[PDB]
Amino acid sequence: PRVGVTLSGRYRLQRLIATGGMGQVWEAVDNRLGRRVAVKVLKSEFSSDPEFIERFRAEARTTAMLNHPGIASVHDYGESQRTAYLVMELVNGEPLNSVLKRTGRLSLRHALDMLEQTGRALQIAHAAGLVHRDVKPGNILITPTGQVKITDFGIAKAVDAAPVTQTGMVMGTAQYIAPEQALGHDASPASDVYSLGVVGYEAVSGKRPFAGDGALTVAMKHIKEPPPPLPPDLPPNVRELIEITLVKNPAMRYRSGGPFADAVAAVRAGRRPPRP
Amino acid sequence: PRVGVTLSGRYRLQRLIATGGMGQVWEAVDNRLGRRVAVKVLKSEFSSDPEFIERFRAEARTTAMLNHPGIASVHDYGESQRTAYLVMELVNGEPLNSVLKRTGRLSLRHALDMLEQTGRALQIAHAAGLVHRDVKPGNILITPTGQVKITDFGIAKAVDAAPVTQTGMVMGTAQYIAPEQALGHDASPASDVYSLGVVGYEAVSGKRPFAGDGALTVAMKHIKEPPPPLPPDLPPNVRELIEITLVKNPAMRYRSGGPFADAVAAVRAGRRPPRP
């Protein structure tokens, strides 16, 4: 699993570009079309699990039928000679977590824009029956021109993990988890909204709203802790928009990506956040 | 014409906030609704001209029927005891020329956003038969949240000035003039597009494309001079988008605000500028 390997005789691996709990992402060339792409190569522990692969493919498949500037394309699945993989768009952009490592916060203007873009991208997905379920800065790529591209819809949460409250463990991070997810309820479009509110909270104010040593620590605060008031210098309408997104009851939030994005637009336009 | 004057017994002047060739703009309170507003009080030389007032009102009137986040509202016209005025939205934002006095250029991301916002705002106007005719940074207000608001549709150009090529004089600036306007042709939606391309050229690169000592100097360069190549470090698609906007023949540009904005979206999204 390395440079020069040509998966299913089609996709030639060039460089290792991302990594994670489920596998690694590589820059490749599609040699049938002579197009550079991203390939997520799954770890054997996932490749070898029939049922996990079924759920994984169900999500990816749906994402591959969505055409929108803010959804990173999903091109194909394959297995090669044992080794499962997903072929994706190679996005020329920088993960939001990377961006913030430098700036601490985003400019208010850029934050709202990003939030609104992400919300429109999620809404296409939500309209198709598709929940992201792992919204977080590492899944929000920003290109040089400011286009937000959203990666990895559905797939991380296809591992059918028990509640974090009971296991004390999460694949990836619990820093953006929706409280109902941390409880073991299946995500809904309102869960993505909440997790985008966390991203939003981070992006405007400088820091995430909840921290702690370990998944269980942070996840519990999501369930039980009112978030710390955002900085008083932020327009109240902006603060209020974010506060709404972070209510514990999913039934009391903006219900999906479109209503949220619209609420971001009303706020950019100087109006108070609309009724969720 | 000063603080405490209550125009037509309704609008009470508070503070002098803008100024210019045609008159002055004041912060006021509407005392019928208890709402803060902006009032353009016209100079006597314009108040006293029947025909100029007719054309002035024809433009303002049309703008007042457009409801869009990017068009600064036009609320009413009146005359008080002699003195003509136009009642407008009081926009809490900073003119683009003001912004640039500090930053020199905008960030690429902010520039595209502004351009696209302005283009959508112009398109509503263009769809109504309304041309702005004096697109320039001083008519592009930017609020703390990044909402662009466009002021003064139509009205500056209601003075029915002869060609700048022949008079050597322009009311306001010639720095953003469309070549066909500088020639004495009536503006079209494509003229606004061109002038937004100049704004765009300025906003991305640091400086306006044409300068010179006096209206005639700059206006002639608009007619005759190919603009200086934009900085090579800018994405080619961005450069190309702007180059298209600045062709001399209006018939070869994006024809109105919507096609332009769409072209800005394609470029933000990493695609080359669409066919005008």
Curated annotation (Swiss-Prot), chains A, B:
Highest taxon listed in the record's lineage: Bacteria
Q: Where does the UniProt annotation locate this protein?
A: Cell membrane
Q: What class of enzyme is it?
A: transferase
**Where does this protein hold ATP?**
I17, A18, T19, G20, G21, M22, G23, Q24, V25, K40
Cysteine pairs forming cystine bridges in this chain are none
Reported function:
Protein kinase that regulates many aspects of mycobacterial physiology. Is a key component of a signal transduction pathway that regulates cell growth, cell shape and cell division via phosphorylation of target proteins.
The encoding gene is pknA
How does the protein's chain sit in the membrane according to the entry? Single-pass membrane protein
Please state every residue range assigned to the domain named Protein kinase: 11-265
GO terms under cellular component: plasma membrane
Topology: which residues are Cytoplasmic? 1-276
Q: Which GO terms describe its biological process?
A: regulation of primary metabolic process
Care to name a GO molecular-function term for this sequence?
ATP binding
Which residues are responsible for catalysis?
D134 (proton acceptor)
Source organism per UniProt: Mycobacterium tuberculosis (strain CDC 1551 / Oshkosh)
Free-text description of this protein's post-translational modifications in UniProt? Autophosphorylated. Dephosphorylated by PstP.
Identify the EC number(s): 2.7.11.1
Per UniProt, the keywords (alphabetical) are:
ATP-binding, Cell membrane, Kinase, Membrane, Nucleotide-binding, Phosphoprotein, Serine/threonine-protein kinase, Transferase, Transmembrane, Transmembrane helix
Which reactions appear under catalytic activity for this entry? L-seryl-[protein] + ATP = O-phospho-L-seryl-[protein] + ADP + H(+); L-threonyl-[protein] + ATP = O-phospho-L-threonyl-[protein] + ADP + H(+)
The entry assigns this protein to a family as follows: Belongs to the protein kinase superfamily. Ser/Thr protein kinase family.
| Key word ATP-binding present | yes
- Protein name in the entry: Serine/threonine-protein kinase PknA
